[PDB]
């Protein structure tokens, strides 16, 4: 089933690229994406940012957040987060369910091990853009 | 003096003879013999290592039936190569949804505290690996792997692994 | 002979059980026949797997017992069953996912055939839906255990947290305004009135009645309508389980400690007459009270404080519909998008539980570490997982309990003659 | 006829209370103190446990 | 391809697009298919539209409209709605008075996370190169 | 893997189907049934006729009367004879249909569209192996 | 010493012992044949199915009485070809008056029922029989057949 998971993962990277808005501040962005490390005391700003990329437009305009599936969060991480520190970024996002479970009505919260091995996989087959391939992002920065 | 009753690794009371006779070190490290359940000791008195660049390993399949994510895995081995290959050893953890024959693409490596001496290598140390599968369909495996840029040579020895999922008893006469 | 000429049978039995925190598990089930008196005295010990650090907080342990008449379960299949007698069709079974462990929530080892009689399953459901689960949460409608989660079935299904501002909000549906249909330029004075009446009835009815039995009682009449299928509460007892510590003695430790927990408990049920054949479930549930590393008092985290917030001016708080708050108004790092209605003034009716920030980021501490997320259900139902941090072996899950069930039931079955 | 207990000597409800005066762990016959109803106010004056 | 589950929905769309047109005004079809961001006030208009397409894709085939398939609402949101709004478009559909997510009896109103999970799966490996003049 | 009761019967029906060579479809219907072409409105009538024949099979070849069939047998049929483009309609065609359980227990509980679809799909996958779409029954 | 329906059926198939039921080597062929049944054979269909039913019963001591739906299904599952399972169930549905079997006991057999059981028996689900025999047993015990 992994191919479907992978399929849906890449498919989300395409959506992410159509950012309409990002809330982050130049800095928060220098925080999501840098090589600079996240100490435990940063885990919350980490979540603000990763979350800011997962629910972004919804927030900006005023629609409520609804739960995003794992395959999507993996894209968000693989695409925006530096490799140094994908672990904490996954540690802090554990919980969401895989589309399949959502579809099937089964509760399968996802723990750390999973998000990390999955995103790590996505990152490897996602030359869709590194982020590197798009300076455009900084256009959709904030305000 | 009092007898020590603790050890880093406990071997299975029943050892297996490697049936194969030649391995060819590779990036897709071959699995010397089909993985057994939770513990197995494998011994070979003549394994011909062909020339290659990669490694060969020995498996044990994590018995994922007790509710506990992190468990202790042990490995104890004494291997002697006819020539000094200048290889590094390590415990590996790779999962697969099928009986593996070769170390897949994604695997993890952990340092062991053994001792090298030219063509020799002995070890008895343990490491805690997350034995539950990181991906739904799989089975997770742990094994001892030697890896280098091999030149044809041979090696003798045994390599045994055990997964601490239960303790073994032993006569402590003072009880 | 209305029959007081029954003898006592000894159904007492030891049961070494164990289970999971946050989830209601059945502990024993004794099928009762009609006209039995059933009497129970349960004594035993409750434990928590060896904690990582010394004892810090204790857990409340509620143990229940309910009476679920077969009739509520095989409606009218049962009435024919008994009228029919030896000729009735054998009563449905319900299927189970093929693992040894998985009927766990019913207190039996799944039989080899993957079948369990309906009463055992439908009872638990008929219970969870009536006594745990917020009245607003949807009824759990499941046919067979085939439809459960490894988590949900090999351990019991998740209950609510303890009551408290963010866990027991007003029902999400609670109106914040009633509009009347006025014509441009005129109101129908007499219409207004009727409009309030309709409120008043609705209001009480939503909170102060629910059942058919209630409606009729409001007219001052009585009826024995069973079909609401509400199982009886018989007994229910509550303990706070604690004790011990285990001071370490070798060189590396000394200052190290575990936290062996042992509270012994008696949970008794007095002679209960049993109207008609049926099954008697007990059930047990352990919960650590919620305490956040991040909860703040509303007045300190809402921001600029206005008059209706500090006045306590009963007039306003009296005549003001609920207010929507947001988890961010109550937790540090809480999600503003997600709101919940709260009666005006709860700030002055409840106080937090402050856990100094030196703990947040420490390991053993059954606190809560980070405000839940998710709709008010996924927020109110316990996540049996965030406790694994404070244990060393979840082999025997989170709580052990060696127990000994003294149960005598006075029924009249004949003797071992014939 | 009928009895209920406490909320949240032995039982409560005063009339009930008095009938719980009977028994004789020994009389096997159906007793009136049998029967019941129980009240944990959380539920009665609330929703769930 | 696991998409075994969406093929009819996609099938109808092809046919519809090529062969006919669906009840939508000209600027409405823009609304649906375009880069424009959907602000808060665009809700009714969002429903009004996505509904339109779904009933359409449905008629063509021969399905009735009340029990409205969760898989068709997926295809439509998946195809016509621009990626900038494939998320918000799911929200606007939550608990639409036509669909029923049925799980073991339980005809439960469709929650907006399964709509997104469905769409994020149709989009998984299909052609959606849709704007149109 | 598990696969219990309901699925186990879905398999068993697939086995009956392989063996019951017999149908009441004319060459072209068998095409229609299996076609990769989608089915549109006007086509429905044959869709009924074809799917239905694919269920009551040997009963239609020789004309004995009909039989309401269980939701598992119906899904085997759809898993075996219908193009994935078309599994969905194959079901609205076969709606009210009780699972074996309900038939046995006396609980009439008709199944609808989405439900058979979910099931058929699950049946589809467990039979990937036994699914071999080998047209060695293309007659009468 | 207790051999049960289900084991009887498989036993008798294993060693095709038509003799045990009251079928002729020829009858056995109809039953278990790869031949489509036509409505001219209909009568020999029942004749033979019933023969397997009341046969094995007699083989396992159940004094006669009527046969429980689930028993007919087993027969239709072990002894009939997958080509006729449908038509076989159609041939047993309803109470066609019998040989010399107890009157005031005939309760029409629903058709679908017959098939729902045959599929389950045809699938590995033996419990439908097992449970079903005991009910039979108990009836027969209160009745005094033990």
Swiss-Prot record, chain C:
Native source organism of the sequence: Enterobacteria phage phiX174
Cross-referenced Pfam families: Phage_F
Single biological process term from Gene Ontology: symbiont entry into host cell
Gene label: F
Family of the protein in this entry: Belongs to the microviridae F protein family.
InterPro entries for this protein: Capsid/spike_ssDNA_virus (IPR016184), Microviridae_protein_F (IPR003514), Microviridae_protein_F_sf (IPR037002)
Function: Assembles to form an icosahedral capsid with a T=1 symmetry, about 30 nm in diameter, and consisting of 60 capsid proteins F. Upon virus binding to host cell, one of the spikes dissociates from the capsid and the virus interacts with LPS through the exposed EF loops on the F proteins. After the genome had been ejected, the channel formed by the F proteins at the unique fivefold axis remains open.
A GO molecular function held by the record: structural molecule activity
Gene Ontology cellular component list: T=1 icosahedral viral capsid
Assembly notes: Pentamerizes and interacts with H protein, G and B pentamers to form 12S pre-assembly complex. By binding with protein D, induces joining of twelve 12S complex to form the procapsid. The procapsid has an external scaffold made of 240 copies of protein D, 60 copies of the internally located B protein, and contains 60 copies of each of the viral structural proteins F and G. Upon genome packaging, interacts with protein J. The mature virion is composed of 60 copies each of the F, G, and J proteins, and 12 copies of the H protein.
Disulfide topology: none
Keyword Cell cycle applies: no
Record-given protein name: Capsid protein F
Main location: virion
Entry's localization field: Virion
Curated annotation (Swiss-Prot), chain D:
Broad class of the protein's primary localization: host cell
PTM comment, free text: The proteolytic cleavage of the internal scaffolding protein B releases the scaffold protein in order to continue virion assembly.
Cellular location(s): Host cytoplasm
Keywords assigned: Autocatalytic cleavage, Host cytoplasm, Hydrolase, Protease, Viral capsid assembly, Viral release from host cell
InterPro entries in the record: Phage_B, Phage_B_sf
GO terms, molecular function: peptidase activity
UniProt entry tagged with the keyword Protease: yes
Gene Ontology cellular component list: host cell cytoplasm; viral scaffold
GO biological process, one term: proteolysis
The protein's role, per its UniProt record: Participates in the assembly of the viral procapsid in the cytoplasm. Forms first a 12S pre-assembly complex with protein H, and F and G pentamers, then twelve 12S complexes are joined by the D protein to form the procapsid. Internal scaffold protein B is released from the procapsid upon genome packaging. Autoproteolytic activity cleaves protein B and probably facilitates its removal through the pores of the procapsid.
Protein name: Internal scaffolding protein B
The species this protein was found in: Enterobacteria phage phiX174 (Isolate Sanger)
Gene: B
From Swiss-Prot, chain E:
Outcome of swapping residue 56 to V: Confers a lethal phenotype
InterPro entries: Scaffold_D (IPR004196), Scaffold_D_sf (IPR036632)
Domain of life: Viruses
A biological process term (GO) from this entry: viral procapsid maturation
Coiled coil (residue ranges): none
Pfam family of the protein (one): gpD
Annotated keywords: Host cytoplasm, Viral capsid assembly, Viral release from host cell
Gene3D superfamilies: Scaffold protein D
Cellular location(s): Host cytoplasm
One GO cellular component term: host cell cytoplasm
Family per similarity comment: Belongs to the microvirus D protein family.
Function per UniProt: Assembles the procapsid by joining twelve 12S pre-assembly complex into a T=1 icosahedral particle, called 108S procapsid. Ten proteins D bind each 12S complex, which are formed by three pentamers of F, G, B protein and a H protein. The scaffolding protein is released from the provirion after genome packaging to form the mature virion.
Self-association state and partner proteins as the record states: Component of the procapsid particle composed of 60 copies of the internally located B, 240 copies of the external scaffolding protein D, 60 copies of each of the viral structural proteins F and G, and 12 copies of protein H.
Protein name listed in UniProt: External scaffolding protein D
Protein's gene: D
UniProtKB/Swiss-Prot annotation, chain F:
UniProt entry keywords in alphabetical sequence: Host cytoplasm, Viral capsid assembly, Viral release from host cell
Effect of residue 57 to D: Confers a lethal phenotype
Compartment annotation: Host cytoplasm
InterPro entries: Scaffold_D, Scaffold_D_sf
One matching Pfam family: gpD
Gene3D superfamilies linked: Scaffold protein D
Matches recorded under SUPFAM superfamilies: Scaffolding protein gpD of bacteriophage procapsid
A single cellular component GO annotation: host cell cytoplasm
Ranges that cross the membrane: none
One record GO biological process: viral procapsid maturation
Family label: Belongs to the microvirus D protein family.
Subunit structure, as described in the record: Component of the procapsid particle composed of 60 copies of the internally located B, 240 copies of the external scaffolding protein D, 60 copies of each of the viral structural proteins F and G, and 12 copies of protein H.
Job description of the protein: Assembles the procapsid by joining twelve 12S pre-assembly complex into a T=1 icosahedral particle, called 108S procapsid. Ten proteins D bind each 12S complex, which are formed by three pentamers of F, G, B protein and a H protein. The scaffolding protein is released from the provirion after genome packaging to form the mature virion.
Annotated protein name in UniProt: External scaffolding protein D
Biological source species: Enterobacteria phage phiX174
